Amino acid sequence: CQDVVQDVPNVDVQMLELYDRMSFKDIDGGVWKQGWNIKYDPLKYNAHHKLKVFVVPHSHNDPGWIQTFEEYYQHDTKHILSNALRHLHDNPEMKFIWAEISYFARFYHDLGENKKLQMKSIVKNGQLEFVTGGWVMPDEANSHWRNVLLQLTEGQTWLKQFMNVTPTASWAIDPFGHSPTMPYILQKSGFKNMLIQRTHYSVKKELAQQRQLEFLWRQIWDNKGDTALFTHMMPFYSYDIPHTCGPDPKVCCQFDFKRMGLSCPWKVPPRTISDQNVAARSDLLVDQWKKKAELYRTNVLLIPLGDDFRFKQNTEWDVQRVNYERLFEHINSQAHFNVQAQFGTLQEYFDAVHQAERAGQAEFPTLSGDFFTYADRSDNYWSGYYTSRPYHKRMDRVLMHYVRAAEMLSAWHSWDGMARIEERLEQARRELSLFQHHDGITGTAKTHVVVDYEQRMQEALKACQMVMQQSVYRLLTKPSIYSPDFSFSYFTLDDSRWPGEDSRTTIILGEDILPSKHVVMHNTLPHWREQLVDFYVSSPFVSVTDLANNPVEAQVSPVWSWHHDTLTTIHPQGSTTKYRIIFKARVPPMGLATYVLTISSKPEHTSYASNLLLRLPLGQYPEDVKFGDPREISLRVGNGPTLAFSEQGLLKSIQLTQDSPHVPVHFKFLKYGVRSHGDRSGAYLFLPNGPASPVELGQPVVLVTKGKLESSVSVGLPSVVHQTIMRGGAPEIRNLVDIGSLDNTEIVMRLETHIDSGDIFYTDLNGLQFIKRRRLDKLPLQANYYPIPSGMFIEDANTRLTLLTGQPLGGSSLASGELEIMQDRRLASDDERGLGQGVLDNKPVLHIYRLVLEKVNNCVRPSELHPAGYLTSAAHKASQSLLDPLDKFIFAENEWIGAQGQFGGDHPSAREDLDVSVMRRLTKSSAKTQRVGYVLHRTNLMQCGTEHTQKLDVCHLLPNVARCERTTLTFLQNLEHLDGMVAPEVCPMETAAYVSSHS
Ligand SMILES: [Zn+2]
């Protein structure tokens, strides 16, 4: 295994280093506004050295933006695919590429056998070629890596199953910024090349000037270059026809034969190609081509030909095809051009490029880093969408976890087809897959479309719960009893965090209404976990036992809610009929643990929290509420940190241990505005008019709850209920955010330390890796905002502070010792990127965080020059507690004969840096050989020199292994037959996939 800490890779282009030297000057380049006047030597080209041009027709199809998936399908996409099918069929030299498998699957299932076979025909002959082959073309900023891999697996599985094809070239023309997570997943899924579009205009200029637009893109820690993927970055402002033929959009636009009810902004129309003009039109176009080719190292040129929802009408197919045919026939017949031009596919382009390299005509540069934050022009940085529609951003994470848990839970058994497991899982994967779209998780879609996304995710959550409950009943009922009704609710799910919602079951216990209640906890992670869990109960006199009837220590706290008296003030109210029972659930790796809640007066092993209101009846509750003037507060749970809070109930300092210092750590809410003159912030753009200013907090009500297992500080701020929860380690932060009214406002949460971070900070990419960022004072504020998909940190010689998130949001470190993360944004103006609206549809979201202060001076850190950072064990586990908590199940009935106490107590408890990211059964009951796929990710944690673990071999997890294969990440190809049927060890920062066959 490579060393990802000691050794700094050598690459031609390192993006952090690149950004440091770049001036980012927005100069007028001329007809190429953001470049220069391309010159080529016309004697470069002769009969020995021709330009080879691939004109690649395409149609960008959004699975939701202005319209819903179904709306666009009905209006646009179904017509495009019928025409493609007809036109390619009748025109054997015509070519077409296709990205979005969601729409292809939808269309293909509606075809008659005949059309099905004809369609297979034009795929087999290579005329219609699938690119990437994902369900969608996903967002790359906010998306979790697991979800990127999910949407990819979904489209490619569909392709392999229905078309017997697996794309090896990727096409990503539209995401707003590009992540190295994409080459990382794609190269582990058999890909050979990929294409990107949306990078900062100033980065395109810099690279274009050195012919570094094609590059071998490797991971920032990769010393060897094993991860490298060949990447083509297109050079110009857009993927549309004006911006794809060459440098001068005024010329290129004349070669979009659909604009003769569409027209050319530059006021020069296209003209039909005839014998009259062909020489002149050809000359104009090839000049364009040769200008573009000068930016690349080979004599092979990629010319994309299309636009959004293009190739819809029969006559668009003719006008495009026939005019370009006339051009090609003329160009290729005339030796003075020294050009071979034709219709081609993406993979055809890449093949010819690799032919040129293998012949030694070019050596390509190496690149590591990322392409965030993107700007299309002047100071219009697209950091807005790191935050837009934050409720759905959080919904993504919750759904992500429920599909994982549903697929793992049900993977253990084969299910009769009447249970409908395969169907529910299929729906849940597809819904979650669709939201990966660059108008889904991004928050850049119209309100009714966001509505559609939400309803779909909701149905997907319901489908996971139905699978999870059925699986749990099967796993913990004695086989001699197990007799299921697949439409029965054996368990209801209990979620303390989604939606946060006046739902949640109260368990109603009574000395003879119902005395005891069985609850089960599921642990999706492959090691033993202990975690505080909570349930709502109808009495404060409840005690906890395991199934063996051993006592478990518990605490009871009141249920509190916050009201806006509107008359007055934001105040808490306490329940008189529901209480919270809290205890530590111990749960096996990938396993289940049953507990019992029994009613009794005050039990032996249950304590009662106290309540202090700083500025209230509580039912059958033992400790009466106390009252107080606003004051500073210090709490400690267990031996864990001691935390001091302001008189406004905001964290002020943390003390790690009894004898360590009181470390200043201040939370502050601030607000950013929109511009006086200038451009207006929208769904995409963040255009603050100066540094944020502090929110006026007044004198708010601070609620303090103090218990032996769990304590917390909650405060009703204007817009935000803010809570710090203490369980013994790193606290959890919850914000209930209601931006409600406050137009042209962005609400930020900032941390202020004395940590001597300077200009350095660290943000993660897709929850997979942490990348070094440098704050740049030469760039505007919005350009120092980066995606925070799961966490961020600052550090000095001695001290780290890391914030872990349950939800993708935007964030920065805008001064030494600070971290900051946007909570919500409300926006009266459109930012003119196509959407037509601002963001005027906000709703209450519960944001969750963990807050880790640590001493790092005895940690093995990477050198000053390494572009990556690495989490500690504590910060890694805190992240895992946010994204993959314990699942909670309440038995829905009164008696559970058969009940067992635990599942998975024999499962190996693997090293903490290792996760079984996916467990998914791959075969229905009707197959003779059962097969299960596993995705394994091993992260890399700092060695701080800070435990008993067993070897985990996924091939042996289930009984009667007959075969085990190391596979691509999508499970679709074998990469190594494992003679042993034992899975090899995986390296730090690697992801591997195994498929186990069972007899
Ligand atoms: Zn798009």
Side-chain angles (χ1 to χ4, degrees), residues 120 123 128-130 133 155-168 972:
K120 283 183 151 72
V123 174
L128 167 67
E129 183 181 278
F130 299 100
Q156 294 211 333
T157 306
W158 193 99
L159 288 165
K160 174 109 271 185
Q161 192 167 352
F162 296 109
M163 283 289 148
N164 195 36
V165 306
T166 297
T168 60
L972 304 166

mmCIF file with all atom_site columns, all heavy atoms in Angstrom, residues 120 123-124 128-130 133 155-168 972, unseen atoms left out:
data_model
loop_
_atom_site.group_PDB
_atom_site.id
_atom_site.type_symbol
_atom_site.label_atom_id
_atom_site.label_alt_id
_atom_site.label_comp_id
_atom_site.label_asym_id
_atom_site.label_entity_id
_atom_site.label_seq_id
_atom_site.pdbx_PDB_ins_code
_atom_site.Cartn_x
_atom_site.Cartn_y
_atom_site.Cartn_z
_atom_site.occupancy
_atom_site.B_iso_or_equiv
_atom_site.pdbx_formal_charge
_atom_site.auth_seq_id
_atom_site.auth_comp_id
_atom_site.auth_asym_id
_atom_site.auth_atom_id
_atom_site.pdbx_PDB_model_num
ATOM 1   N N   . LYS A 1 120 ? -31.691 -1.888 -30.354 1.00 0.00 ? 120 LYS A N   1
ATOM 2   C CA  . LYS A 1 120 ? -30.517 -2.681 -29.995 1.00 0.00 ? 120 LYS A CA  1
ATOM 3   C C   . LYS A 1 120 ? -29.506 -2.694 -31.142 1.00 0.00 ? 120 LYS A C   1
ATOM 4   O O   . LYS A 1 120 ? -28.306 -2.521 -30.937 1.00 0.00 ? 120 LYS A O   1
ATOM 5   C CB  . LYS A 1 120 ? -30.852 -4.129 -29.630 1.00 0.00 ? 120 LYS A CB  1
ATOM 6   C CG  . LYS A 1 120 ? -31.425 -4.323 -28.264 1.00 0.00 ? 120 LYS A CG  1
ATOM 7   C CD  . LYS A 1 120 ? -31.624 -5.810 -28.047 1.00 0.00 ? 120 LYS A CD  1
ATOM 8   C CE  . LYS A 1 120 ? -31.529 -6.267 -26.603 1.00 0.00 ? 120 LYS A CE  1
ATOM 9   N NZ  . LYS A 1 120 ? -32.730 -5.789 -25.910 1.00 0.00 ? 120 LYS A NZ  1
ATOM 10  N N   . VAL A 1 123 ? -27.364 0.486  -31.262 1.00 0.00 ? 123 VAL A N   1
ATOM 11  C CA  . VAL A 1 123 ? -26.446 0.494  -30.142 1.00 0.00 ? 123 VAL A CA  1
ATOM 12  C C   . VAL A 1 123 ? -25.350 -0.496 -30.533 1.00 0.00 ? 123 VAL A C   1
ATOM 13  O O   . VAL A 1 123 ? -24.183 -0.211 -30.374 1.00 0.00 ? 123 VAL A O   1
ATOM 14  C CB  . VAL A 1 123 ? -27.150 0.182  -28.793 1.00 0.00 ? 123 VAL A CB  1
ATOM 15  C CG1 . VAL A 1 123 ? -26.161 0.044  -27.624 1.00 0.00 ? 123 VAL A CG1 1
ATOM 16  C CG2 . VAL A 1 123 ? -28.166 1.270  -28.454 1.00 0.00 ? 123 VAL A CG2 1
ATOM 17  N N   . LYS A 1 124 ? -25.711 -1.647 -31.100 1.00 0.00 ? 124 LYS A N   1
ATOM 18  C CA  . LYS A 1 124 ? -24.712 -2.663 -31.399 1.00 0.00 ? 124 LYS A CA  1
ATOM 19  C C   . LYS A 1 124 ? -23.801 -2.107 -32.489 1.00 0.00 ? 124 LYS A C   1
ATOM 20  O O   . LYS A 1 124 ? -22.609 -2.350 -32.456 1.00 0.00 ? 124 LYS A O   1
ATOM 21  C CB  . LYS A 1 124 ? -25.249 -4.058 -31.822 1.00 0.00 ? 124 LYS A CB  1
ATOM 22  C CG  . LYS A 1 124 ? -24.268 -5.260 -32.038 1.00 0.00 ? 124 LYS A CG  1
ATOM 23  C CD  . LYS A 1 124 ? -24.770 -6.714 -32.100 1.00 0.00 ? 124 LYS A CD  1
ATOM 24  N N   . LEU A 1 128 ? -25.623 4.830  -31.856 1.00 0.00 ? 128 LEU A N   1
ATOM 25  C CA  . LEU A 1 128 ? -26.065 5.479  -30.633 1.00 0.00 ? 128 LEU A CA  1
ATOM 26  C C   . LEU A 1 128 ? -25.142 5.002  -29.519 1.00 0.00 ? 128 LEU A C   1
ATOM 27  O O   . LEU A 1 128 ? -25.024 3.783  -29.329 1.00 0.00 ? 128 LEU A O   1
ATOM 28  C CB  . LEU A 1 128 ? -27.537 5.162  -30.373 1.00 0.00 ? 128 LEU A CB  1
ATOM 29  C CG  . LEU A 1 128 ? -28.033 5.515  -28.971 1.00 0.00 ? 128 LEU A CG  1
ATOM 30  C CD1 . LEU A 1 128 ? -28.010 7.009  -28.831 1.00 0.00 ? 128 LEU A CD1 1
ATOM 31  C CD2 . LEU A 1 128 ? -29.458 5.043  -28.920 1.00 0.00 ? 128 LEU A CD2 1
ATOM 32  N N   . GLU A 1 129 ? -24.386 5.923  -28.890 1.00 0.00 ? 129 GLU A N   1
ATOM 33  C CA  . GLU A 1 129 ? -23.384 5.469  -27.908 1.00 0.00 ? 129 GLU A CA  1
ATOM 34  C C   . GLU A 1 129 ? -23.702 6.135  -26.582 1.00 0.00 ? 129 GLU A C   1
ATOM 35  O O   . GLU A 1 129 ? -23.947 7.355  -26.559 1.00 0.00 ? 129 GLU A O   1
ATOM 36  C CB  . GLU A 1 129 ? -21.985 5.975  -28.274 1.00 0.00 ? 129 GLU A CB  1
ATOM 37  C CG  . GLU A 1 129 ? -20.851 5.508  -27.365 1.00 0.00 ? 129 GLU A CG  1
ATOM 38  C CD  . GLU A 1 129 ? -19.511 6.073  -27.806 1.00 0.00 ? 129 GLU A CD  1
ATOM 39  O OE1 . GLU A 1 129 ? -18.926 5.483  -28.720 1.00 0.00 ? 129 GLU A OE1 1
ATOM 40  O OE2 . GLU A 1 129 ? -19.003 7.087  -27.291 1.00 0.00 ? 129 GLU A OE2 1
ATOM 41  N N   . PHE A 1 130 ? -23.800 5.320  -25.515 1.00 0.00 ? 130 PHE A N   1
ATOM 42  C CA  . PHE A 1 130 ? -24.103 5.820  -24.166 1.00 0.00 ? 130 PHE A CA  1
ATOM 43  C C   . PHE A 1 130 ? -22.844 6.367  -23.507 1.00 0.00 ? 130 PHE A C   1
ATOM 44  O O   . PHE A 1 130 ? -21.784 5.749  -23.648 1.00 0.00 ? 130 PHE A O   1
ATOM 45  C CB  . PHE A 1 130 ? -24.696 4.742  -23.292 1.00 0.00 ? 130 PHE A CB  1
ATOM 46  C CG  . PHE A 1 130 ? -26.012 4.230  -23.863 1.00 0.00 ? 130 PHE A CG  1
ATOM 47  C CD1 . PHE A 1 130 ? -26.060 3.025  -24.583 1.00 0.00 ? 130 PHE A CD1 1
ATOM 48  C CD2 . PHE A 1 130 ? -27.180 4.992  -23.714 1.00 0.00 ? 130 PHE A CD2 1
ATOM 49  C CE1 . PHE A 1 130 ? -27.280 2.569  -25.107 1.00 0.00 ? 130 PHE A CE1 1
ATOM 50  C CE2 . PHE A 1 130 ? -28.404 4.555  -24.218 1.00 0.00 ? 130 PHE A CE2 1
ATOM 51  C CZ  . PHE A 1 130 ? -28.458 3.312  -24.863 1.00 0.00 ? 130 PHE A CZ  1
ATOM 52  N N   . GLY A 1 133 ? -23.395 6.878  -18.629 1.00 0.00 ? 133 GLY A N   1
ATOM 53  C CA  . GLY A 1 133 ? -24.360 5.795  -18.456 1.00 0.00 ? 133 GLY A CA  1
ATOM 54  C C   . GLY A 1 133 ? -24.900 5.796  -17.018 1.00 0.00 ? 133 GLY A C   1
ATOM 55  O O   . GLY A 1 133 ? -25.398 4.774  -16.566 1.00 0.00 ? 133 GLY A O   1
ATOM 56  N N   . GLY A 1 155 ? -27.691 3.271  -13.496 1.00 0.00 ? 155 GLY A N   1
ATOM 57  C CA  . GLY A 1 155 ? -27.761 3.421  -14.935 1.00 0.00 ? 155 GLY A CA  1
ATOM 58  C C   . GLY A 1 155 ? -26.972 2.320  -15.655 1.00 0.00 ? 155 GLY A C   1
ATOM 59  O O   . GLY A 1 155 ? -27.419 1.711  -16.630 1.00 0.00 ? 155 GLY A O   1
ATOM 60  N N   . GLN A 1 156 ? -25.779 1.997  -15.144 1.00 0.00 ? 156 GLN A N   1
ATOM 61  C CA  . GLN A 1 156 ? -24.960 1.003  -15.821 1.00 0.00 ? 156 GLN A CA  1
ATOM 62  C C   . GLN A 1 156 ? -25.543 -0.409 -15.676 1.00 0.00 ? 156 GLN A C   1
ATOM 63  O O   . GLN A 1 156 ? -25.386 -1.214 -16.612 1.00 0.00 ? 156 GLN A O   1
ATOM 64  C CB  . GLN A 1 156 ? -23.503 1.110  -15.382 1.00 0.00 ? 156 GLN A CB  1
ATOM 65  C CG  . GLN A 1 156 ? -22.858 2.423  -15.834 1.00 0.00 ? 156 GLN A CG  1
ATOM 66  C CD  . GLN A 1 156 ? -21.390 2.180  -16.082 1.00 0.00 ? 156 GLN A CD  1
ATOM 67  O OE1 . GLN A 1 156 ? -20.797 1.274  -15.482 1.00 0.00 ? 156 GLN A OE1 1
ATOM 68  N NE2 . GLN A 1 156 ? -20.807 2.890  -17.042 1.00 0.00 ? 156 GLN A NE2 1
ATOM 69  N N   . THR A 1 157 ? -26.201 -0.700 -14.530 1.00 0.00 ? 157 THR A N   1
ATOM 70  C CA  . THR A 1 157 ? -26.834 -2.002 -14.348 1.00 0.00 ? 157 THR A CA  1
ATOM 71  C C   . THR A 1 157 ? -27.936 -2.172 -15.397 1.00 0.00 ? 157 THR A C   1
ATOM 72  O O   . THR A 1 157 ? -28.000 -3.212 -16.081 1.00 0.00 ? 157 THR A O   1
ATOM 73  C CB  . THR A 1 157 ? -27.351 -2.267 -12.930 1.00 0.00 ? 157 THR A CB  1
ATOM 74  O OG1 . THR A 1 157 ? -26.220 -2.030 -12.087 1.00 0.00 ? 157 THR A OG1 1
ATOM 75  C CG2 . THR A 1 157 ? -27.995 -3.662 -12.755 1.00 0.00 ? 157 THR A CG2 1
ATOM 76  N N   . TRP A 1 158 ? -28.805 -1.155 -15.466 1.00 0.00 ? 158 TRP A N   1
ATOM 77  C CA  . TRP A 1 158 ? -29.805 -1.054 -16.528 1.00 0.00 ? 158 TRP A CA  1
ATOM 78  C C   . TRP A 1 158 ? -29.154 -1.248 -17.925 1.00 0.00 ? 158 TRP A C   1
ATOM 79  O O   . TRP A 1 158 ? -29.669 -1.983 -18.761 1.00 0.00 ? 158 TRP A O   1
ATOM 80  C CB  . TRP A 1 158 ? -30.680 0.224  -16.397 1.00 0.00 ? 158 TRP A CB  1
ATOM 81  C CG  . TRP A 1 158 ? -31.904 0.180  -17.297 1.00 0.00 ? 158 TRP A CG  1
ATOM 82  C CD1 . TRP A 1 158 ? -33.154 -0.158 -16.894 1.00 0.00 ? 158 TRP A CD1 1
ATOM 83  C CD2 . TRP A 1 158 ? -31.987 0.302  -18.731 1.00 0.00 ? 158 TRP A CD2 1
ATOM 84  N NE1 . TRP A 1 158 ? -34.007 -0.237 -17.958 1.00 0.00 ? 158 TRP A NE1 1
ATOM 85  C CE2 . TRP A 1 158 ? -33.328 0.003  -19.104 1.00 0.00 ? 158 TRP A CE2 1
ATOM 86  C CE3 . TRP A 1 158 ? -31.077 0.646  -19.744 1.00 0.00 ? 158 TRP A CE3 1
ATOM 87  C CZ2 . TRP A 1 158 ? -33.796 0.043  -20.428 1.00 0.00 ? 158 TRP A CZ2 1
ATOM 88  C CZ3 . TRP A 1 158 ? -31.531 0.679  -21.060 1.00 0.00 ? 158 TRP A CZ3 1
ATOM 89  C CH2 . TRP A 1 158 ? -32.869 0.350  -21.395 1.00 0.00 ? 158 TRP A CH2 1
ATOM 90  N N   . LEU A 1 159 ? -27.990 -0.655 -18.182 1.00 0.00 ? 159 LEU A N   1
ATOM 91  C CA  . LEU A 1 159 ? -27.441 -0.736 -19.527 1.00 0.00 ? 159 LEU A CA  1
ATOM 92  C C   . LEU A 1 159 ? -26.980 -2.151 -19.804 1.00 0.00 ? 159 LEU A C   1
ATOM 93  O O   . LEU A 1 159 ? -27.229 -2.623 -20.904 1.00 0.00 ? 159 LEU A O   1
ATOM 94  C CB  . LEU A 1 159 ? -26.358 0.276  -19.919 1.00 0.00 ? 159 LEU A CB  1
ATOM 95  C CG  . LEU A 1 159 ? -26.863 1.703  -20.127 1.00 0.00 ? 159 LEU A CG  1
ATOM 96  C CD1 . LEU A 1 159 ? -25.638 2.612  -20.141 1.00 0.00 ? 159 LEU A CD1 1
ATOM 97  C CD2 . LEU A 1 159 ? -27.592 1.761  -21.490 1.00 0.00 ? 159 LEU A CD2 1
ATOM 98  N N   . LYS A 1 160 ? -26.167 -2.706 -18.893 1.00 0.00 ? 160 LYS A N   1
ATOM 99  C CA  . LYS A 1 160 ? -25.703 -4.080 -18.999 1.00 0.00 ? 160 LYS A CA  1
ATOM 100 C C   . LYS A 1 160 ? -26.903 -5.008 -19.124 1.00 0.00 ? 160 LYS A C   1
ATOM 101 O O   . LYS A 1 160 ? -26.909 -5.782 -20.052 1.00 0.00 ? 160 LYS A O   1
ATOM 102 C CB  . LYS A 1 160 ? -24.964 -4.598 -17.772 1.00 0.00 ? 160 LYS A CB  1
ATOM 103 C CG  . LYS A 1 160 ? -24.566 -6.047 -17.755 1.00 0.00 ? 160 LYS A CG  1
ATOM 104 C CD  . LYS A 1 160 ? -23.108 -6.409 -17.896 1.00 0.00 ? 160 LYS A CD  1
ATOM 105 C CE  . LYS A 1 160 ? -22.912 -6.533 -19.356 1.00 0.00 ? 160 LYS A CE  1
ATOM 106 N NZ  . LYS A 1 160 ? -21.565 -7.008 -19.711 1.00 0.00 ? 160 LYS A NZ  1
ATOM 107 N N   . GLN A 1 161 ? -27.928 -4.866 -18.270 1.00 0.00 ? 161 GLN A N   1
ATOM 108 C CA  . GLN A 1 161 ? -29.042 -5.811 -18.310 1.00 0.00 ? 161 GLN A CA  1
ATOM 109 C C   . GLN A 1 161 ? -29.801 -5.727 -19.640 1.00 0.00 ? 161 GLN A C   1
ATOM 110 O O   . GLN A 1 161 ? -30.193 -6.758 -20.149 1.00 0.00 ? 161 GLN A O   1
ATOM 111 C CB  . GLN A 1 161 ? -29.956 -5.593 -17.120 1.00 0.00 ? 161 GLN A CB  1
ATOM 112 C CG  . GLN A 1 161 ? -30.996 -6.669 -16.863 1.00 0.00 ? 161 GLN A CG  1
ATOM 113 C CD  . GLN A 1 161 ? -31.582 -6.450 -15.481 1.00 0.00 ? 161 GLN A CD  1
ATOM 114 O OE1 . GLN A 1 161 ? -31.098 -5.610 -14.699 1.00 0.00 ? 161 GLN A OE1 1
ATOM 115 N NE2 . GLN A 1 161 ? -32.658 -7.168 -15.175 1.00 0.00 ? 161 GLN A NE2 1
ATOM 116 N N   . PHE A 1 162 ? -29.996 -4.527 -20.204 1.00 0.00 ? 162 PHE A N   1
ATOM 117 C CA  . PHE A 1 162 ? -30.938 -4.353 -21.294 1.00 0.00 ? 162 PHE A CA  1
ATOM 118 C C   . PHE A 1 162 ? -30.241 -4.224 -22.646 1.00 0.00 ? 162 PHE A C   1
ATOM 119 O O   . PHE A 1 162 ? -30.818 -4.569 -23.673 1.00 0.00 ? 162 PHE A O   1
ATOM 120 C CB  . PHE A 1 162 ? -32.040 -3.351 -20.945 1.00 0.00 ? 162 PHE A CB  1
ATOM 121 C CG  . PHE A 1 162 ? -32.905 -3.835 -19.791 1.00 0.00 ? 162 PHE A CG  1
ATOM 122 C CD1 . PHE A 1 162 ? -32.801 -3.205 -18.553 1.00 0.00 ? 162 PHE A CD1 1
ATOM 123 C CD2 . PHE A 1 162 ? -33.791 -4.928 -19.933 1.00 0.00 ? 162 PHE A CD2 1
ATOM 124 C CE1 . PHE A 1 162 ? -33.538 -3.645 -17.453 1.00 0.00 ? 162 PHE A CE1 1
ATOM 125 C CE2 . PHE A 1 162 ? -34.568 -5.402 -18.833 1.00 0.00 ? 162 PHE A CE2 1
ATOM 126 C CZ  . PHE A 1 162 ? -34.418 -4.774 -17.585 1.00 0.00 ? 162 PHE A CZ  1
ATOM 127 N N   . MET A 1 163 ? -29.002 -3.742 -22.638 1.00 0.00 ? 163 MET A N   1
ATOM 128 C CA  . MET A 1 163 ? -28.305 -3.377 -23.863 1.00 0.00 ? 163 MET A CA  1
ATOM 129 C C   . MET A 1 163 ? -26.979 -4.121 -23.977 1.00 0.00 ? 163 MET A C   1
ATOM 130 O O   . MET A 1 163 ? -26.324 -3.972 -25.003 1.00 0.00 ? 163 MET A O   1
ATOM 131 C CB  . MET A 1 163 ? -28.054 -1.868 -23.932 1.00 0.00 ? 163 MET A CB  1
ATOM 132 C CG  . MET A 1 163 ? -29.285 -1.071 -24.302 1.00 0.00 ? 163 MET A CG  1
ATOM 133 S SD  . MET A 1 163 ? -29.835 -1.249 -26.021 1.00 0.00 ? 163 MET A SD  1
ATOM 134 C CE  . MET A 1 163 ? -31.555 -1.032 -25.581 1.00 0.00 ? 163 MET A CE  1
ATOM 135 N N   . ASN A 1 164 ? -26.613 -4.938 -22.960 1.00 0.00 ? 164 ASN A N   1
ATOM 136 C CA  . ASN A 1 164 ? -25.295 -5.575 -22.924 1.00 0.00 ? 164 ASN A CA  1
ATOM 137 C C   . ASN A 1 164 ? -24.219 -4.529 -23.303 1.00 0.00 ? 164 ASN A C   1
ATOM 138 O O   . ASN A 1 164 ? -23.305 -4.865 -24.075 1.00 0.00 ? 164 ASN A O   1
ATOM 139 C CB  . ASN A 1 164 ? -25.250 -6.901 -23.731 1.00 0.00 ? 164 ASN A CB  1
ATOM 140 C CG  . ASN A 1 164 ? -24.039 -7.747 -23.418 1.00 0.00 ? 164 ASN A CG  1
ATOM 141 O OD1 . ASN A 1 164 ? -23.607 -7.762 -22.256 1.00 0.00 ? 164 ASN A OD1 1
ATOM 142 N ND2 . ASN A 1 164 ? -23.420 -8.416 -24.393 1.00 0.00 ? 164 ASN A ND2 1
ATOM 143 N N   . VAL A 1 165 ? -24.280 -3.262 -22.797 1.00 0.00 ? 165 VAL A N   1
ATOM 144 C CA  . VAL A 1 165 ? -23.137 -2.342 -22.968 1.00 0.00 ? 165 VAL A CA  1
ATOM 145 C C   . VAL A 1 165 ? -22.745 -1.709 -21.621 1.00 0.00 ? 165 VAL A C   1
ATOM 146 O O   . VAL A 1 165 ? -23.643 -1.407 -20.865 1.00 0.00 ? 165 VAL A O   1
ATOM 147 C CB  . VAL A 1 165 ? -23.303 -1.276 -24.077 1.00 0.00 ? 165 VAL A CB  1
ATOM 148 C CG1 . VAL A 1 165 ? -23.649 -1.927 -25.412 1.00 0.00 ? 165 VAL A CG1 1
ATOM 149 C CG2 . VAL A 1 165 ? -24.435 -0.283 -23.784 1.00 0.00 ? 165 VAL A CG2 1
ATOM 150 N N   . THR A 1 166 ? -21.440 -1.413 -21.384 1.00 0.00 ? 166 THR A N   1
ATOM 151 C CA  . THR A 1 166 ? -20.907 -0.650 -20.263 1.00 0.00 ? 166 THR A CA  1
ATOM 152 C C   . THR A 1 166 ? -20.011 0.482  -20.802 1.00 0.00 ? 166 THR A C   1
ATOM 153 O O   . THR A 1 166 ? -18.831 0.290  -21.117 1.00 0.00 ? 166 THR A O   1
ATOM 154 C CB  . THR A 1 166 ? -20.146 -1.632 -19.353 1.00 0.00 ? 166 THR A CB  1
ATOM 155 O OG1 . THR A 1 166 ? -21.076 -2.568 -18.850 1.00 0.00 ? 166 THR A OG1 1
ATOM 156 C CG2 . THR A 1 166 ? -19.414 -1.023 -18.163 1.00 0.00 ? 166 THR A CG2 1
ATOM 157 N N   . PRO A 1 167 ? -20.477 1.742  -20.819 1.00 0.00 ? 167 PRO A N   1
ATOM 158 C CA  . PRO A 1 167 ? -19.609 2.875  -21.192 1.00 0.00 ? 167 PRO A CA  1
ATOM 159 C C   . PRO A 1 167 ? -18.308 2.944  -20.408 1.00 0.00 ? 167 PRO A C   1
ATOM 160 O O   . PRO A 1 167 ? -18.326 2.642  -19.205 1.00 0.00 ? 167 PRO A O   1
ATOM 161 C CB  . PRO A 1 167 ? -20.520 4.036  -20.802 1.00 0.00 ? 167 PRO A CB  1
ATOM 162 C CG  . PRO A 1 167 ? -21.935 3.481  -21.017 1.00 0.00 ? 167 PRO A CG  1
ATOM 163 C CD  . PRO A 1 167 ? -21.806 2.145  -20.326 1.00 0.00 ? 167 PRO A CD  1
ATOM 164 N N   . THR A 1 168 ? -17.228 3.371  -21.088 1.00 0.00 ? 168 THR A N   1
ATOM 165 C CA  . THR A 1 168 ? -15.901 3.591  -20.486 1.00 0.00 ? 168 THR A CA  1
ATOM 166 C C   . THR A 1 168 ? -15.451 5.043  -20.643 1.00 0.00 ? 168 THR A C   1
ATOM 167 O O   . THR A 1 168 ? -14.344 5.388  -20.223 1.00 0.00 ? 168 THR A O   1
ATOM 168 C CB  . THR A 1 168 ? -14.835 2.633  -21.055 1.00 0.00 ? 168 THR A CB  1
ATOM 169 O OG1 . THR A 1 168 ? -14.817 2.925  -22.458 1.00 0.00 ? 168 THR A OG1 1
ATOM 170 C CG2 . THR A 1 168 ? -15.096 1.140  -20.826 1.00 0.00 ? 168 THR A CG2 1
ATOM 171 N N   . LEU A 1 972 ? -20.071 -4.885 -12.028 1.00 0.00 ? 972 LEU A N   1
ATOM 172 C CA  . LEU A 1 972 ? -20.495 -5.366 -13.353 1.00 0.00 ? 972 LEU A CA  1
ATOM 173 C C   . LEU A 1 972 ? -19.418 -6.159 -14.075 1.00 0.00 ? 972 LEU A C   1
ATOM 174 O O   . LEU A 1 972 ? -19.719 -6.882 -15.000 1.00 0.00 ? 972 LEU A O   1
ATOM 175 C CB  . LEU A 1 972 ? -21.203 -4.346 -14.264 1.00 0.00 ? 972 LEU A CB  1
ATOM 176 C CG  . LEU A 1 972 ? -22.452 -3.669 -13.680 1.00 0.00 ? 972 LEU A CG  1
ATOM 177 C CD1 . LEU A 1 972 ? -22.722 -2.499 -14.601 1.00 0.00 ? 972 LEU A CD1 1
ATOM 178 C CD2 . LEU A 1 972 ? -23.618 -4.652 -13.664 1.00 0.00 ? 972 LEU A CD2 1
#
